[PDB]
RNA sequence: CUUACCUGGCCUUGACAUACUAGAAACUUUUCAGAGAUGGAUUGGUGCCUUCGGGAACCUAGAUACAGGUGCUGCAUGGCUGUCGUCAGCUCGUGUCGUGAGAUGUUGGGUUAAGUCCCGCAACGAGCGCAACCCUUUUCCUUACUUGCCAGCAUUUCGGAUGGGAACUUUAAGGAUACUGCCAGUGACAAACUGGAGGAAGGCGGGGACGACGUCAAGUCAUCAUGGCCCUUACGGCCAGGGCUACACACGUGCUACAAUGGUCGGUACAAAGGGUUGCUACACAGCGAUGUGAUGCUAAUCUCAAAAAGCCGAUCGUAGUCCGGAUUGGAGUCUGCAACUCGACUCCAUGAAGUCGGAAUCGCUAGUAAUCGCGGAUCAGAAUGCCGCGGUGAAUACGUUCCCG
């Protein structure tokens, strides 16, 4: 806005793992206020991924999130009637938000029977290093690298 | 743009309703229609007596009309015969018998309705509109209102193009709900059509809320 | 064993409270014991009325009317108390029902 | 549909005209405005002219029509195409 | 662009008028093409059942792809004159806006 | 022994607290029976795990109005107030947690000319 | 509305009042089980033979002051146009503006 | 019916008011002709007051001014309403300045949401607007103990059901509280602005009413009133059928879907606001069902509408135009009503359409908000996906004002 500084709201930690990050991820998954189904989906995916390799689900999630987080982005600047995409750094909150959104969207566009299965597949793919969220991270790096020249 | 009714906005705040009775959901419509009929009858009967308010009350299986008049003599009658006929007509109109009471007005030029009728009379008799307006404003301010406002709209002077003209002096804080504002409207029927008259009179700010009014 | 039930209905809570206070005072003068006044849920009735003569659906006035109810019991009443209650006058706007 | 327990509906004047016609033997059409009556089984073999809004259209009542209302055979609108 | 033309009770409207208005308006404003998606013209007679020098009001409102809708009014003694005045004013307004936005 | 009242979104909870083994009843029912949703149970349980003295108390709870989330919030508020009444020294930590505060958020009414409190009809400019 | 409309409404009400008793008796006979089938049929025929205006279904509510057939608002008996005026003059007991 | 439109059949001082004359209580029972409006027959009563020789009611018959008009003109008007726009502005008196139109005040610095406030200044003063007074929600206290409530006691066909209690929830009137009040900073040492303690709540706490001077010959002669024109055996009045529901098409606002964050089946929890005597109806039976019969309690914090649904637990479905979707059509019914053909709502059996996520373009929304889930009401014999309300679950994102508009 043109004034004020709106403060951020507090997301309570999830029941099972007591993680605010996992609670925020559930909020990203949630639709129409169906948070119970959101938790069911997320926990089913986490159990599925834990089945493949025996590791802490919270540690796996945060490692994959760090893998998928962005580094650099451009914000369009309209001067002289031209786009002038100018690379810039982004705050950690934006980093986490874009990472989570990319993960969820990639899972949604995957092709398994259930949201839990395809979310687990996306987490595994991001851990490996080949996924749609990884591709969006690569593309944003590529474009901010092409336009590095400007400040 | 448009404005809320000055009385309409203060019913439960600093003013009281003009009707005080209780009815069950079934007899409410009958009571309201008959109250409107009796008001219509009284307005026509007492046209020349300078009546200001009518308070219709149904205590129990009966009726009580309170008429506020500047000329109690005409309504009362020289020998009191007129009041008997009035109560007879009221009992004919309303199923239960009605009793009349009279409230004498001793400062008529503080009542918005009376001022509006006075202006409308001159306007129908073809006096200059902004002569009548200034006369009414000066009379009310001499009476002692903290402010008065007059509005006259229509074909003033017979003009083909209708217009509105107003004059205000003193204070008329319409947006203040705790202020005593009397509002009145009247119609003047002239050979060239209708002219509308609106009067606002401000009698200071009421203190203590509806409790002071003793509702 | 006789108990008298009193029910007051009005459109003005100030008037109904005045009436109930007068009833309880009248009972106290006679010397009987009375329970109340007991407030009862108020009824609200709301109506939407178009303000433009011809066509403006969004420009309306919203009015409401409220019905206020009050309950009183008087127990161990005496012959003088009942006659005092009947003799007491009634003001308008407050419909009073007396049940034996 | 009208409830069965009430039974079929027929106007009194139309009913009486039909009984007069059947009791006698005359093929003169019965002119009427009761499009809301039901074609009773005794109506078969009679010509009944039914108002359709501005004129009376004839109907020769046969076994098929029993159960329909009179107005179902006298259309009220004139449409020929756009 | 889709054309939605409307009149009032005084003016009197017909599908012939619809076809003619659509044809003329498209012919005049054919250059912009994709820039503009919707036209709506409206016709009235003000003091209906009387006469005067203007006595008829034409309006045309157009939606340009992108920028916000823009409107134009004209008063004239005849339907054709009102339409021509409104067309000229629209042309001038659109030219000015497009030159401004470049 | 010590009483507390909790309120949240039209829901009201009456909480009675007395030192005991750890029993917890809601409307003649257990927490698992009453709340089939895990978030509600976690919310109900936060205040007494916060003081690390969960099983040294016994609770008797009644609730009315609202839905599952509102009832859970009301029950937690009642437990917090019961603890504060029982001991004065609990209030600073409980407030630091934020349980002492009473949430005042409520549904906003529908408004004239609008589909909902804030949502309004479509105004197309296609 | 027109005086002809108002007079038609009044005559319809008068006819309904005239024939209400016979209509009710015929309907009771129709709904009576112990009554014979032929009696029920005759009751049905008489009810169908009654005058049309005797049927209350043919009555339309009207403002009373103006006779307008829309916005009737049963409780007050006035159409919205006149109800707003009467309310905001202060002549309708208990009715106020609503804000909640 | 509404109804103002059309086809046809009818009346003419009129369906409604006042003025004049004469006879009759008003009214009332039956049929007959007809589509009805209407017409022609036929029964019973003869009432209420009187200086009773005449009068009130309510009819009939004649005559004349007249009634009647949803006919025209919103560009002749009153009243009412929309929009710029809750935008923050708009103006006066006394002074001054200028030949004058006019100017100052209302301009300059900070600042506020704001012509809100503090400093200067040929200005000094006022009014209408801003804010406050009004309703609702959050915390607590007093009064009130019902029909509403059940903490300590007891009895229980374990149901606050009972004897009981006045604690708690609640109900509905009256009060308190919150004022930058206090601390640490900033600014001219001014207004004012940041960070803190305490508190349920902290810097307008969140919503609702409240519409300045004025603008668009803006809308409404069809709510109503009203000037001026028009018809008067019809542009007035009564009636039966039909129409307002038509269908080569084009637009605006919605509802339902295109499924697995889901469909179906079984079990199982948690609301708030309203409605009910010409009505809501416990409960038993009959029916697959819409419903019907008997019957019970309610003029209601007492009886009732009433089943809350999303939700949770278990089973099946396993990506198919499908166990997704429910348009269209064929049979059989219930109910409301004088009467469901044109043209009603709902129930059962059978059928199973387009649709597999939608061009350019464009809309709403900053928090208990959006999204989603169900419940009630006004109108109303019956007939809501519309309108006005109620509660349940419950988000995403604001770096910033550079380019977009007002
Ligand atoms: Mg059928
Ligand atoms: Mg115009
Ligand atoms: Mg909602
Ligand atoms: Mg609310
Ligand atoms: Mg008329
Ligand atoms: Mg009806
Ligand atoms: Mg019709
Ligand atoms: Mg106008
Ligand atoms: Mg017009
Ligand atoms: Mg204000
Ligand atoms: Mg017209
Ligand atoms: Mg008809
Ligand atoms: Mg229509
Ligand atoms: Mg299906
Ligand atoms: Mg297909
Ligand atoms: Mg209905």
From Swiss-Prot, chain A:
Alphabetically ordered keywords of this record: Ribonucleoprotein, Ribosomal protein, RNA-binding, rRNA-binding, tRNA-binding
Highest taxon of source: Bacteria
Gene Ontology terms for molecular function: rRNA binding; structural constituent of ribosome; tRNA binding
TM region(s), chain numbering: none
PROSITE patterns attached to this UniProt entry: RIBOSOMAL_S7
Function: One of the primary rRNA binding proteins, it binds directly to 16S rRNA where it nucleates assembly of the head domain of the 30S subunit. Is located at the subunit interface close to the decoding center, probably blocks exit of the E-site tRNA.
HAMAP family: Ribosomal_uS7_B
Protein name: Small ribosomal subunit protein uS7
Origin species: Acinetobacter baumannii (strain AB0057)
UniProtKB/Swiss-Prot annotation, chain D:
GO CC field: cytoplasm; small ribosomal subunit
UniProt keyword list: Ribonucleoprotein, Ribosomal protein, RNA-binding, rRNA-binding
Gene3D superfamilies: 30s Ribosomal Protein S19, Chain A (3.30.860.10)
InterPro entries, alphabetized: Ribosomal_uS19, Ribosomal_uS19_bac-type, Ribosomal_uS19_CS, Ribosomal_uS19_SF
Organism: Acinetobacter baumannii (strain AB0057)
Stated role: Protein S19 forms a complex with S13 that binds strongly to the 16S ribosomal RNA.
Listed name of the protein: Small ribosomal subunit protein uS19
GO molecular-function terms, A-Z: rRNA binding; structural constituent of ribosome
Record family assignment: Belongs to the universal ribosomal protein uS19 family.
Keyword rRNA-binding recorded: yes
Biological process annotations from GO: ribosomal small subunit assembly; translation
Curated annotation (Swiss-Prot), chain G:
Coiled-coil region: none
One GO-annotated biological process of the protein: translation
Any one cellular-component term (Gene Ontology): cytoplasm
Domain of life of the native organism: Bacteria
Keywords linked to the UniProt accession: Ribonucleoprotein, Ribosomal protein, RNA-binding, rRNA-binding
GO molecular function per UniProt: rRNA binding; structural constituent of ribosome
PROSITE patterns, per the entry: RIBOSOMAL_S14 (PS00527)
Summary of subunit composition and partner proteins: Part of the 30S ribosomal subunit. Contacts proteins S3 and S10.
Main function: Binds 16S rRNA, required for the assembly of 30S particles and may also be responsible for determining the conformation of the 16S rRNA at the A site.
Family: Belongs to the universal ribosomal protein uS14 family.
Protein name: Small ribosomal subunit protein uS14
Protein's organism: Acinetobacter baumannii (strain AB0057)
Gene, per the UniProt record: rpsN
């Amino acid at each position: 806005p043109r004034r004020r500084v709106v403060a951020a709201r507090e997301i309570l930690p999830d029941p099972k793992f007591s993680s605010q990050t996992i609670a925020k991820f559930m909020n990203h998954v949630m639709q129409d206020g169906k948070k119970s189904i959101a938790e069911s989906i997320v926990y089913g995916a986490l159990e599925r991924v834990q089945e493949k390799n025996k590791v802490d689900p919270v540690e796996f999630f945060e490692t994959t999130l760090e893998k998928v987080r962005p580094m650099v982005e451009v914000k369009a600047r309209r001067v002289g009637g031209a786009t002038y995409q100018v690379p810039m750094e982004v705050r950690p909150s934006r980093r986490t938000a874009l990472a989570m959104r990319w993960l969820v969207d990639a899972a949604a566009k995957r092709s398994e029977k259930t949201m839990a299965l395809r979310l687990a597949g996306e987490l595994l793919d991001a851990a490996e290093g080949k996924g749609a969220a990884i591709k969006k991270r690569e593309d944003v790096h590529r474009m901010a690298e092409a336009n590095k020249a400007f400040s | 743009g448009q404005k809320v009714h000055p009385i309409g906005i203060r019913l439960g705040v600093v003013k009281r309703h003009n009707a005080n009775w209780y009815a069950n959901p079934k007899q409410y419509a009958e009571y309201l229609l008959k109250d409107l009929q009796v008001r219509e009858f009284l307005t026509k009967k007492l046209k020349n007596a300078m009546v200001s308010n009518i308070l219709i009350e149904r205590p129990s299986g009966a009726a009580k009309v309170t008429i506020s008049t500047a000329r109690p003599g005409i309504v009362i009658g020289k020998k009191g015969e007129d009041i008997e006929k009035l109560q007879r007509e009221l009992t004919n109109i309303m199923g239960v018998p009605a009793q009349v009471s009279i409230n004498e007005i001793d400062r008529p030029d503080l009542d918005a309705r009376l001022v509006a009728e006075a202006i409308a009379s001159q306007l129908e008799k073809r006096v200059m509109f902004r002569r009548a307006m200034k006369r009414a404003v000066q009379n009310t301010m001499r009476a002692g209102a903290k402010g008065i406002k007059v509005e006259v709209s229509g074909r003033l002077g017979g003009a083909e193009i209708a217009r509105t003209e107003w004059y205000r002096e003193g204070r008329v804080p319409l947006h203040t709900l705790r202020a005593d504002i009397d509002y009145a409207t009247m119609r003047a029927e002239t050979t060239y059509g209708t002219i509308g008259v609106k009067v606002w009179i401000f009698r200071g700010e009421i203190l203590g809320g509806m409790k002071q009014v003793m509702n | 064993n006789q108990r008298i039930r009193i029910r007051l209905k009005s459109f003005d809570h100030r008037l109904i409270d005045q009436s109930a206070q007068e009833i309880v005072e009248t009972a106290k003068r006679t010397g009987a014991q009375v329970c109340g006044p007991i407030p009862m849920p108020t009824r609200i009735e709301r109506f939407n009325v178009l303000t433009s003569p011809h066509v403006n659906k969004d420009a309306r006035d919203q009015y409401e009317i409220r019905t206020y109810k009050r309950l009183i019991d008087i127990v161990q009443p005496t012959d003088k108390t009942v006659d005092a209650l009947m003799k007491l006058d009634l003001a308008a706007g407050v419909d009073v029902q007396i049940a034996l | 549909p009208r409830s069965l327990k009430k039974g079929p509906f027929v106007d009194a004047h139309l009913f009486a005209k039909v009984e007069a016609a059947v009791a006698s033997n005359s093929r003169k059409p019965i002119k009427t405005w009761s499009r809301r009556s039901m074609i009773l089984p005794d109506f078969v073999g009679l010509t009944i002219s039914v108002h359709n809004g501005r004129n009376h259209v004839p109907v020769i009542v046969t076994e098929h029509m029993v159960g329909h209302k009179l107005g179902e055979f006298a259309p009220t609108r004139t449409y020929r195409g756009h | 662009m889709n054309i939605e033309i409307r009149t009032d009770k005084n003016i009197h409207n017909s599908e012939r008028l619809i076809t003619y208005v659509r044809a003329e308006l498209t012919q005049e404003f054919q250059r912009h093409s994709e820039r503009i998606t919707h036209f709506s013209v409206h016709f009235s007679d003000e003091n209906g059942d009387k006469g005067g020098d203007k006595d008829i009001h034409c309006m045309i409102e157009a939606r340009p792809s992108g920028l916000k809708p823009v409107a134009v009014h004209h008063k004239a003694g005849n339907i054709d004159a009102s339409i021509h005045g409104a067309i000229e004013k629209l042309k001038r307004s659109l030219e000015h806006t497009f030159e401004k936005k470049e | 022994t010590n009483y507390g009242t909790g309120r949240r979104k039209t829901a009201t909870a009456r909480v009675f607290l007395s030192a005991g083994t750890g029993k917890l009843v809601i409307n003649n029912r257990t927490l698992e029976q009453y709340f089939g949703r895990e978030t509600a149970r976690m919310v109900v349980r936060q205040p007494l795990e916060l003081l690390e003295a969960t099983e040294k108390y016994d609770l008797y709870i009644t609730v009315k109005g609202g839905g599952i989330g509102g009832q859970a919030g009301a029950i937690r508020h009642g437990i917090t107030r019961a603890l504060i009444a029982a001991d004065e020294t609990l209030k600073p930590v409980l407030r630091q947690a934020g349980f002492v505060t009473r949430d005042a958020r409520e549904v906003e009414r529908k408004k004239l000319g609008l589909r909902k409190a804030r949502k309004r009809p479509q105004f197309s400019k296609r | 509305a027109k005086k002809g409309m108002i007079n038609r409404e009044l005559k319809r009400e008068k006819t309904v009042a005239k024939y209400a008793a016979k209509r009710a008796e015929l309907k009771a006979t129709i709904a009576n089980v112990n009554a014979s089938d032929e009696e029920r049929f005759e009751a049905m025929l008489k009810l169908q033979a009654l005058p049309r205006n005797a049927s209350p279904v043919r009555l339309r509510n009207r403002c009373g002051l103006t006779g307008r057939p829309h916005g009737y608002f049963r409780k007050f008996g006035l159409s919205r146009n006149k109800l707003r005026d009467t309310v905001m003059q202060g002549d309708v007991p208990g009715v106020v503006k609503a804000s909640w």
